[model samples]
Target chain A: TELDQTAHQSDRLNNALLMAIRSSANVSSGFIEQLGGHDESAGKRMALSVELNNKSQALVDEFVENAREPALRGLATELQATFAEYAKAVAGQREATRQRSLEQYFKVNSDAGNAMGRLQTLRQQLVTTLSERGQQIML
Target chain B: ELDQTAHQSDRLNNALLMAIRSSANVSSGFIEQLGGHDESAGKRMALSVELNNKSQALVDEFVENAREPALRGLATELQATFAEYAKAVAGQREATRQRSLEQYFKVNSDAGNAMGRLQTLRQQLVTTLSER
Candidate 1:
C-alpha cells in the first residue's frame, strides 16, 4: 500500500507536468514558426515574442523544479527500496534452482528436499514483498 | 518432466531481465525530466545516459549467457523490447541536443509516453510469468 500510494501520486504529478510541458512547447514552437510571417508593429511584435519565450521557459522551469523533480526523486527512493527486496528474493530463487539442479543430475535425497523447502520459503517472501509493492521487478 | 532445473533457470532469467528493464525505465524518466536546462541538468543527463548503456549491456550479456533453450524466444523478445526502449531514450536525447528548450519538452513528453506503454507491457509479462 505504501508503494502503491507513492506510485499513484507520482503518476499524477508526472502526467500534469508532462501535459504542461507539451502545451508550453507547442505555443513556443508555433510562435517561433509564425514570427516574421506577416507585417505588424515591429516593436510590439518583438516585445510579444520575447514575452512568449520568457513565459514558456519560466513555466517549464517552475514545473521541473517544483513538481517533476520531487515526484521523480520520491519514486526513485521508493524503487530503490523495492529493488533491495527483489534482490533478496532473487537470491532465494537461485538457491532453490541450484538445489533442484543438483537433485536432477545426481539423485534425490533428503538434503535436496530440505533445501527445496527452505528455498520455497524464500520465494514466498519475495512474492509477498512484490505483492505489497504492487509492481514486478526481478532481481 | 523436463526438470525443474530448466524451469527455475528460465524464471530467474525473467526476473533478472525485468529488474534491469525497470531500472532503465526509471533512469530514463529521470533524464527526461532533467532535459537541457542548465549545466547541472546536463551533467545529470550524462550520468543517466551512462547508466542506461550499462544496463543494456548487462541485458545483452545475460541473454548470451543464459543456457535455457526453451525460453530463447522470450529472451529474444525481451531483447527487442529493451532495444525499442533504448531508442526512445536516445531519441529524446537527440531532441534536446540543440538545447532548444521547447523541443526538449516536446520530444521528451512524447518519449515518456512511449516508455509508459513499454512499462505496461513489461508488467503484463512479469505478472504472467510469475503466475506460471
Candidate 2:
C-alpha cells in the first residue's frame, strides 16, 4: 500500500507546495511594491515575508523528509534546493528594502522570479515523474 | 537495449500526456476564476501564463528526442501553437492585472480558444507517439 499511498502523499505535498509558491509570488510582488517609497505597507509586507520564509522552510523540510521514499529522493532534493533559493532571495530583498537601495531591491525581485520559474519547471517534472510512477506501480 | 528504448518512449509519452492534463487543469482554472473583479483572478492569471510557458518548455524537450518526422513536426507545431497561445494568455493576464473587465472577457475568450487548440495538439502528439 506504500506504492498506492505514494501518489496521494506526493499530491498532497504538491498542492501544499503549489499554494506556497503562489503565496510567495503574491507577497513578493506586493512587498516590492511597498518598498517603493510608499513605506507604510512595509510593516505588513515584512510580516508576510516572515510567514513565507517559515512556510517555505517547513515545506522544504517536509519534502526532504519524504525523500526517503527512494523513488522521490533526487528530484525532491533538487526541488527543495529551488525553494531554498527563493527564500534566500526574499531575505536579500528584505535587507535591501530596509536600506532603501532601489537597485538592490529590484535585483532581488527579479532574482526571486527566476528562482520561481526554475521551481515551476522542476514542479512540472516532478508531477510527470509521479504520474509515470503510477503506471509503473500499476503495471 | 530494446527495454531502454521502450522506457524512453514511455517516458516521452507520459510527459506528453502530462502536458495535455496540465493544460486542461490550468485552462479550467482560468475559465472558472479569471473573469471578474475578484482578486484571485490576478493570481490565477499569472499562474496560467507560467503554466503555458512550462508547456512550451516540455514540447521543446520532446522535439529534442523525437525521431519520427511526423511527431517532430507535430511537436514543432506545438511549439508555435504554444507560443501563439502564450501571447493570448499573456494578454489575458495583462487585462486581469489591469482589472479591465472588458478586455479580460475579450482576451479571455481568445485565450480559451487558443487553449483548446493547444490541448488538441498535445493530445494528438501523445496519441501519435503511442501508436509508434
Candidate 3:
C-alpha cells in the first residue's frame, strides 16, 4: 500500500507543483517583456519571487509532516531546495530584468534557466530513487 | 543488519526514483517551449527523453533483481509507464520552448535555467532518498 499510496500522492503533488512553476515562469516572462522599463521588470520579478516563495513554502511544510514515507520525503526535500533556489533566481532576475541597456535581460533569462535545470535534475533523481525501491516494497 | 540494508536500499531507490520522475515532468514543460524554433532545445529535449529511458531501465532492473517479492512486477510496470509518460511530456516542452523564443536569448537562457532547476532538485532528492 505504501508504494501505491506514495506514487499516487507524489503524482498529485508533482503535477500541481509543475503547473505552478510553469505558470509562474510564463507570467514572469511576460512581465519581464511587457514592463519594458528597468524598474517595471524589477517589480515583476519581485512579484514572481513572492509567488515562488509561497508555493515552495507550502511544499516544504508538507514534507516536514505529511511525507512520512522515506521515498516521498526525499522527493519533497528536492522540491524544497528547488523552491529556495528559484527564490534566489527570481531575485537575481530582478537585476537582469531591471538593466535596460544591457544584453537584453541576459541575467534574467539565465537565472531563470538555471533554476529550471535544477528543478529537472531534482525531479529525475527522485523518480529513480523511488522506483528502484519498489521491488523491496512488494517483497 | 540485512533487513536494515534492504530497507535502506528500498528507501533510497524510491527517493531517487521520485526525483527522476519530477525532473522528467518538469523537463517536459521546458522542452515544450523549445519544440519548434530552437534546434538546440529540441536536441536537449531528446536527450532528456534518453535520460528518462535510462532511469526506467534502472527501475526495471531493480524490480527484477532486488529481493523484494510483493511489488517487484508492479514497480517495473510503473517505471515503464512513467518513462513513457515523461517522454510524451518532454515533447510538449520542446514545442513550448520554440514558441516562446520571441526574446532570442531568453529561449537559450531559459533552457539552461530549466536544466539547473532539475539538477538542484535531483541533489535534494538524492540526499533525502538515501537516508537510513
Superposed model 2: Cα runs more than 4 Å off = A32-40, A69-71, B1-132
- Candidate 2 clashing pairs, residues 3+ apart or interchain: none
Model 3 per-residue lDDT tens digits across residues B52-105:
566555555554553444344444444444445455444445434444423422
Off by over 4 Å in 3: A32-53, A69-78, A94-104, A132-135, B1-132
Full-model lDDT for every candidate: 0.39, 0.54, 0.47
TM-score of each: 0.36, 0.48, 0.41
Answer with 1 or 3, whichever has the higher DockQ.
3
lDDT of 2 by residue, A1-139 (tens): 6554554444444444444443443343333334334455555655655674666567666766765656677888888888878788767766765675645655665677688678767766766676667558858
TM-scores of chain A across candidates? 0.26, 0.75, 0.59
**Where is model 1 chain B poorest over a 10-residue stretch in terms of lDDT?**
B23-32
Arranged by DockQ with the best first, the candidates are 3, 2, 1
Question: For model 1, how does the per-residue alpha-carbon lDDT over A1-139 read when each residue is reduced to its tens digit?
Answer: 4444433343333232223222222222222222223223223323432343344334323323432335344443433333234333323322332333322211222232243234334333433343334443321
For model 2, the interface Cα RMSD in angstroms equals: 11.7
Q: Write the per-residue lDDT of candidate 2 for residues B30-121, one digit (tens) a residue.
A: 33342232554445555555655565565566667666676768867876776665666566556545644455444433544554475456
Best by DockQ: 3
Which has the higher lDDT value, candidate number 1 or candidate number 3? 3
Residue B45 lDDT (model 3): 54
Ten-residue segment with the worst summed lDDT in candidate 1 chain A? A102-111
True contacts kept of 2: 0.00
Candidate 3 lDDT, A31-63, residue by residue in tens: 434443344544544565466556655754564
Docking class of 2: incorrect
